[PDB]
Design a protein around this ligand. Structure first.
Ligand SMILES: Nc1nc2c(ncn2[C@@H]2O[C@H](COP(=O)(O)OP(=O)(O)NP(=O)(O)O)[C@@H](O)[C@H]2O)c(=O)[nH]1
Ligand SMILES: [Ca+2]
Length: 295
């Protein structure tokens, strides 16, 4: 991911090197190509437009038309714009003595696998997590998490078919108290598409369990479609943060570049592989540099 956009941006900027001062026409042409590169990377249209306008403002604010090294000013301005579009500053969920987080998303988003990856990540951080398979309709879905969780050395509590939210709360609360778990991760039911029934169940489970965080897992490869899912989930359930999976997937990187603008939700973690340790915090600044070939 980002490979296509990265090459287009690096080319647009590099082609200005060693040519002395550039004309306003050169700047406009450059800004247009950047906007086009973003658009072709499935970046939201409004975001792409706002992006080039910000770079334009900041570039002129640095007298790019006067600079003898315009390529450097453009790189510096695009870098800041990329960093901000990607989230600005790295963000992570606030940890308290006791925490209960919800993992929501569609089937195939990597939600379940991410739930297990998240448990391992915080386990290595000194936390004592407890995984909860909350799909009261799909036993096989619950078994998938138990296997994934126990494999990483994390306990997993499976809900029973048709079990009520109140019953789930009780059992989870007990197991957490007995095993002294400080981080409860609830893996909610995942379906191929958004269906009112499931959304209602999620909303209800949220009311009874009262999670302090609701992480929405999204397949970054779905591009802008992911932002549509985010809106639906936020409007019907209420999310606090996002997790973009398959960032290593061969696809455009428009989702990550539009998330902040479109959803207003921070991207906490990123999925970079299938392996259990294929999850790491999302670093806006670091990603911005990688896209511009800064290493
Ligand atoms: N390459 C790669 N694959 C990932 C990543 N995250 C998840 N996957 C893959 O996505 C596939 C689906 O996983 P997942 O969505 O958890 O399972 P599911 O059977 O769709 N159920 P659910 O969607 O409810 O979690 C798996 O093959 C998993 O390895 C990632 O960051 N990178
Ligand atoms: Ca708008």
């Amino acid at each position: 991911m980002f490979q296509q956009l990265s090459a287009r941006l690096q080319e647009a900027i590099g082609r200005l090197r060693g040519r002395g001062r550039i004309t306003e026409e050169d700047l406009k042409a450059t800004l247009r190509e950047i906007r086009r590169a973003l658009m072709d990377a499935d970046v939201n249209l409004e975001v792409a437009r706002d992006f080039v306008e910000r770079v334009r403002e900041e570039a002129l604010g640095k007298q790019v038309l006067e600079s003898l090294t315009p390529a450097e000013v453009i790189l510096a301005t695009v870098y800041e714009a990329l960093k901000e579009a990607l989230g600005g500053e790295a963000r992570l969920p606030v940890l308290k003595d006791r925490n209960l987080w919800f993992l929501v998303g569609l089937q195939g988003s990597g939600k379940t696998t991410t739930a297990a990856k998240l448990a391992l990540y915080y386990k290595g951080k000194g936390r004592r997590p407890l995984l909860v398979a909350a799909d009261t309709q799909r036993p096989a879905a619950r078994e998938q998490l138990r296997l994934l969780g126990e494999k990483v050395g994390v306990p997993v509590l499976e809900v029973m078919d048709g079990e009520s939210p109140e019953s789930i709360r009780r059992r989870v609360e007990e197991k957490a108290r007995l095993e002294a778990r400080d981080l409860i991760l609830v893996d909610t039911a995942g379906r191929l598409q958004i269906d009112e029934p499931l959304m209602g169940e999620l909303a209800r489970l949220k009311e009874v369990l009262g999670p302090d965080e609701v992480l929405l897992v999204l397949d970054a490869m779905t591009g802008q479609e992911a932002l549509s899912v985010a809106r639906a989930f936020d409007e019907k359930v209420g999310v606090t943060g996002l997790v973009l999976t398959k960032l290593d997937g061969d696809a455009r990187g428009g989702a990550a570049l539009s998330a902040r603008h479109v959803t207003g939700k921070p991207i906490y973690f990123a999925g970079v592989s299938e392996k259990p340790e294929g999850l790491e915090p999302f670093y806006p600044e670091r990603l911005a540099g990688r896209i511009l070939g800064m290493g």
